Design a protein around this ligand. Sequence first.
Ligand SMILES: [Zn+2]
Ligand SMILES: [Zn+2]
Ligand SMILES: [Zn+2]
Lengths: 88, 17
Amino acid sequence: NAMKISDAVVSAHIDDEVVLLHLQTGTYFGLDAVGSRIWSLLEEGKRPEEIVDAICAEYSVDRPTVERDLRDFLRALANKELLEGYAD
Amino acid sequence: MKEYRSPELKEYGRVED
Ligand SMILES: [Zn+2]
Ligand SMILES: [Zn+2]
Ligand SMILES: [Zn+2]
């Protein structure tokens, strides 16, 4: 199902990492490495399938691991109101 | 190609505004 980064989130990249600020909850977060890469792909409007394929192309990792980890990561983003439209 | 580690969301808490 269609999803996107919350319109309330500001992203601040700092070499390798991203700091996220949620303007309505007033909470901030950090991402690094693969999390930061996933965030960048979400910023581009990439769908979960596309994100899985990108991580599989860019990292020494098997598809099942990427799928399992991505699901949990997207759920964590959704739980903190950083990502909208998420469904399993 | 890069070494993989599981993506994690780090929470820092309340920002200074
Ligand atoms: Zn970005
Ligand atoms: Zn594919
Ligand atoms: Zn939401």
